[PDB]
Amino acid sequence: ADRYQVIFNRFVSAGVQRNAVYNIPSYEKWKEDLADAASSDNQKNRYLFAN
Amino acid sequence: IALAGVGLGIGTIFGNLLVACARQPNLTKMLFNYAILGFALTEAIGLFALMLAFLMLFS
Amino acid sequence: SSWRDHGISYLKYLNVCTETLHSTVKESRRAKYERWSKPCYTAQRPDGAGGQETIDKVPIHTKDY
Amino acid sequence: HDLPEGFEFMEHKVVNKDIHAPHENLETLRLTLTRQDEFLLREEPVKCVTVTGTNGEYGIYPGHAYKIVQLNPSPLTVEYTDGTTKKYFVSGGFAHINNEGSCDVNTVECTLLDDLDLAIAEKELAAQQAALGSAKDDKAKSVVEIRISVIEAVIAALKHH
Secondary structure, X not given: OOEEEEEEEEEEXXXXXXXXXXXXXXXXXXXXXXXXXXXXOOOHHHHHHHO | OOOHHHHHHHHHXXXXXXXXXXXXXXXXXXXXXXXXXXXHHHHHHHHHHHXXXXXXXXX | OOOHHHOOOHHHHHHHHHHHHHHHEOHHHHHHHHOOOOOOOOOEEEXXXXXXXXXXXXXXXXXXX | OOOOEOOOOOOOOOOOOOOOOOOOOOOOEXXXXXXXXXXXXXXXXXOEEEEEEOOOEEEEOOOOOOEEEEEOOEEEEEEOOOOOEEEEEEOOEEEEEEOOOEEEEEEOOXXXXXXXXXXXXXXXXXXXXXXXXXXXXXXXXXXXXXXXXXXXXXXXXXXXX
16 A cells, blocks of 8 residues: 555544544655655754654 | 784774764765874874884885 | 564554553552453444444454464 | 644654754753653653663663664663652553653553552463463464563562562
């Protein structure tokens, strides 16, 4: 599967319930992005985490 | 024979340099400068041994 | 350790550990923690007649892992 | 029709320190001990935290280098700057250590070592060992051995103190 998505309801307050999304890329695409965040300046915030 | 411990020492520096550049790709500039610094310091010892060899070879 | 060779996934490994850890908790406190490690889930597809056909693709109980 | 991502509603993000920056001398580690999407401790300044990963035991103090540790069923210790020790027991999970001075220990289950009973733990070990003898197949034996490892760790953890 290219991705697994979860579509749920976020309870902001007693009267506010929005719709929220968790997209989870499968291993192959995730490790490829994790490899680019490590080597490249792109995705700075993820550079340390990826390495 | 002193150069054996010099050339090997240089290889040790560069061997670690590659690993450091792999696990910190966005810090390659500082590591390279330090690697050169270590090479020059070891080369100083190599020249000291070389000078002794020349003194005992040409005199 | 040896469970990886048998195909057991990491997630199933954690569920077994959590159940065992909840087992060791005092009887007074077991009620609180044990509510977090009691399987209550199933996978069902609506049958042709309008019934529930249970999918057996993933185990539910740690015994059957 | 674009939908928000579920992380937009979370206002406590992770701060990473740029590698090309000056160092700071930190005397406090901000710990976040979490169980099943519930924090037992939140950004708590502590002196040190001791965690058992697969390789071995790590003693994390402020300024520890960036590292990810795969925990194993074991005790976890937190020592405050005051001089107070708090001991939990975890069944698994991960520990993320950041060079900025933070440690987010996310566990599937984290229970204070006081809650656990040694008498219950001991007799469970005897029963599971008997179960291992009657284990039908290789898979069943592996599962039973997982339980024994946790139980023995619990028994050994409590016998230590």
